[PDB]
């Protein structure tokens, strides 16, 4: 099925944590742990610690999000 | 039948009582090797009669004191500290293994 309570809000890469991990601060309100989307990692697309990025956030855990749009 | 046993009188220090050291033998239940186990019985000797080193037959008796249910039935063979030895020395080793140790 796949519910639809997902979101695409944007933000900026803050920290450059380990294993394709980032502090990404949502333009919206705060920042989340944000991990690099599979797609994106498969197509490489390095991601500097200060880029505007798109996030996929499950209301289930706003605290986390996946980076969708590369830059 | 009142169980009868045999052993060496390793202790003579009491009044009207002797310590008989009955040695037992039997196969170990799982490993089967025959193993020699043993135990001390305080046999009743009213006449002092039996002295340290003797081999006596012990006989199941009516309680005589707490921890004492055997009477010396008869002497099998007199004197033989070679056995009292084993005992004493074994005890003496104890007097070590704990914090310091016992001379070899």
């Amino acid at each position: 099925a796949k519910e639809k309570d997902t979101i695409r809000t944007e933000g900026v890469v803050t920290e450059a944590l380990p294993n394709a991990t980032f502090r990404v601060k949502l333009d919206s309100g705060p920042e989340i742990l944000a991990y690099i989307s599979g797609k994106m990692r498969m197509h490489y697309i390095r991601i500097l610690p200060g880029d505007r990025v798109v996030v996929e956030i499950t209301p289930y855990d706003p605290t986390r999000g996946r980076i969708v749009y590369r830059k | 039948p009142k169980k009868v046993l045999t052993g060496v009188v390793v202790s003579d220090k009491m009044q009207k009582t002797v310590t008989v050291l009955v040695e037992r033998q039997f196969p170990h239940p799982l490993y089967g090797k025959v193993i020699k186990r043993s135990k001390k019985y305080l046999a009743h000797d009213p006449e002092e009669k039996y002295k340290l080193g003797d081999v006596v037959e012990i006989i199941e008796s009516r309680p005589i004191s707490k921890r004492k249910r055997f009477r010396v039935l008869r002497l099998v063979e007199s004197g033989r500290m070679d056995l009292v030895e084993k005992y004493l020395i074994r005890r003496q080793n104890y007097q070590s293994l704990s914090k310091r140790g016992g001379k070899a």
Partner: protein, 124 residues
């Protein structure tokens, strides 16, 4: 070892160690949710597994996995833990029975419904 050695020291029976302190070795244990967060998979997996800290009646407070398409698990929602690790979520040794207590069963299930506490779909 020599036979004599065996007689002396002998073999040591193995001690099994429970992998589910659902205490009192119960089959299930019920508790209350503390947090209904989400966690990331391990070594080679990616996804947002739904998880939940649980205060057990057994006194313990553990992390349980929420099986299914989508739950309705909140906070003070009473739930029943059932034990079952999850290779991707370390620190997660139990699954949460769906269809018991505050854990509503999976809606729109038509297959292994029993393992998702969802009644028989009244087919017309």
């Amino acid at each position: 070892p020599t036979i004599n050695q065996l007689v002396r020291k002998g073999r040591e029976k193995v001690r099994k160690k429970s992998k589910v302190p659902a205490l009192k070795g119960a089959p299930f244990r019920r508790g209350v949710c503390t947090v209904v967060r989400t966690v990331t998979p391990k070594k080679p997996n990616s996804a947002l597994r739904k998880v939940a800290k649980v205060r057990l009646t057994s006194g313990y407070e553990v992390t349980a996995y929420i099986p299914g398409e989508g739950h309705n698990l909140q906070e003070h929602s009473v739930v029943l833990i059932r034990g079952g690790r999850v290779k991707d979520l370390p620190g997660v040794r139990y699954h949460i029975v769906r269809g018991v207590y505050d854990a509503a069963g999976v809606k729109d299930r038509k297959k292994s419904r029993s393992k998702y506490g969802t009644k028989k779909p009244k087919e017309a």
